[PDB]
């Protein structure tokens, strides 16, 4: 428990030294800081996303790019919280109209051989996978509360800044106000929202074992 945050404050510091130090190019020609420059050039345009590459992360610090393959959930958070502390010491002082620091959605690509939908055995639960396919559907974008704040009903006590977890998982509202049993409601005025879609991915046509209809995810 107390070693949890003490590990994190040592991972969120080694994920920050990766963006801040990784270079490319040789010594004869000349170098190029690959991710500071993209952070700056994407922030100043108003985009807020970098595209980290897994081979680079592996070649810089070999342990991190393994955690990221095994526990991607609780480590993408540290990565996206270091991308926000680096995009702060690079673009500041922001000129006039913006002075609140945005949030950086760290995507990530790779150059590794793809699996297939028929090779998703349950031992791959919560591991980065990489599958090809064909989009078959597309929902309409919706909202998804990220940082939500509630309020009691009778005594009007507030308990704010509550953070939702990402993905498709809800939240369990308390029942112990400290007032009737479940006195808590959501305050619609104070809840930050982000978009979210929901696609449908069909497996490539030349990989069906040819007795049936292709499966999808």
């Amino acid at each position: 428990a107390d070693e949890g945050q003490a590990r994190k404050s040592q991972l969120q510091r080694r994920f920050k030294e990766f963006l801040r130090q990784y270079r490319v190019g040789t010594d004869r020609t000349g170098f190029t800081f690959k991710y500071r420059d993209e952070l700056k050039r994407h922030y100043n345009l108003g985009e807020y996303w970098i595209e980290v590459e897994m081979e680079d992360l592996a070649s810089f610090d070999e342990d991190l790019a393994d955690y990221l393959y095994k526990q991607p959930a609780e480590h993408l958070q540290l990565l996206e919280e270091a991308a926000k502390e680096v995009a702060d010491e690079v673009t500041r002082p922001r000129p006039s109209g913006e002075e609140v620091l945005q949030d950086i959605q760290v995507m990530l690509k790779s150059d590794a051989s793809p699996s297939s939908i028929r090779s998703l055995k349950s031992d791959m639960m919560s591991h980065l996978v990489k599958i090809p396919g064909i989009i078959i559907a597309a929902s309409a974008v919706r909202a998804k509360a990220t940082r939500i704040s509630i309020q009691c009903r009778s005594c009007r006590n507030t308990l704010t800044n509550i953070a939702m977890r990402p993905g498709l998982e809800g939240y369990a509202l308390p029942r112990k106000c400290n007032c009737p049993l479940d006195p808590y409601f959501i305050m619609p005025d104070k809840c930050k929202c982000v978009d979210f879609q929901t696609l449908k991915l069909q497996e490539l046509p030349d990989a069906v074992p040819h007795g049936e209809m292709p499966r999808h995810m």
Binding site: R23, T26, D27, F31
Partner: protein, 255 residues
């Protein structure tokens, strides 16, 4: 002839001239060029690089340039045949040969004016002695002995020119030269290592000789890269490092 020392016999002659470099087409010769280049661009020596691929193209190339220049350098070509006839040069032209092919042709060894050889003679060479292969009744009585001499020559030739093989790579001779001058770097060491590894990859040398040469090169590798003993934490990450590995024989398994 055989060049005894490379500093004062090969380099410091072409140091002030306009040389012409003929280059074969194999990784060994590429890596043997890329060091000589870097040794010429460091002392402002005008060269010229002609990539050849056979004997017809080498002859065609010698046709056109044979009057401007009067220095030449052949790299991994033209040490197993005779040179003063296929090209038919003039008298004041000089040729340097830095080839690996074996065995060196005979006349190219007893011709100490026009064809100098940068070949370290401590290789596996056993060249026949000079007069063994090169030049009234008593007239016939002795010319029969000269006929016996010719008959022995026809045999000792067949003894000497019957098996072909390869010696130490060019990219190691050039590196010895580049270390003599005290102007060696890592970039000139990696090309030595590659020009050696290539022979063993294409299976033209014996495992014994390969491990002997690796034993040689490891001293150089450690001389360069060990100077960073404990400062490997305050050396720039963007600066080449060569290391000795005892690693698998699988081809390209890291990609």
């Amino acid at each position: 002839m055989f060049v005894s020392d490379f500093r004062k016999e090969f380099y410091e002659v072409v140091q002030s001239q306009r040389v012409l470099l003929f280059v074969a087409s194999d990784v060994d010769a590429l890596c043997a060029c890329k060091i000589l280049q870097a040794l010429f661009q460091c002392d402002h020596v005008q060269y010229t690089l002609v990539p050849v691929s056979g004997w017809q193209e080498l002859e065609t190339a010698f046709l056109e340039h044979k009057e401007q220049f009067h220095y030449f350098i052949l790299i991994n070509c033209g040490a197993n045949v005779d040179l003063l006839d296929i090209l038919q040069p003039d008298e004041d032209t000089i040729f340097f040969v830095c080839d690996t092919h074996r065995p060196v042709n005979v006349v190219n060894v007893y011709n100490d004016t026009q064809i100098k050889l940068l070949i370290k003679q401590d290789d596996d060479l056993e060249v026949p002695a000079y007069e063994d292969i090169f030049r009234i009744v008593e007239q016939t009585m002795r010319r029969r002995q000269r006929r016996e001499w010719e008959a022995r020559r026809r045999d000792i030739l067949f003894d000497y020119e019957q098996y072909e093989y390869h010696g130490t790579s060019s990219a190691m001779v050039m590196f010895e030269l580049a270390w003599m001058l005290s102007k060696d770097l890592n970039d000139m060491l990696w090309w030595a290592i590659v020009g050696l590894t290539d022979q063993w990859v294409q299976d033209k040398i014996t495992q014994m000789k390969y491990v002997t040469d690796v034993g040689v090169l490891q001293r150089h590798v450690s001389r360069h890269n060990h100077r960073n003993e404990d400062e490997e934490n305050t050396l720039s990450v963007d600066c080449t490092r060569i290391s000795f590995e005892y690693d698998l024989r699988l081809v390209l398994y890291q990609h």
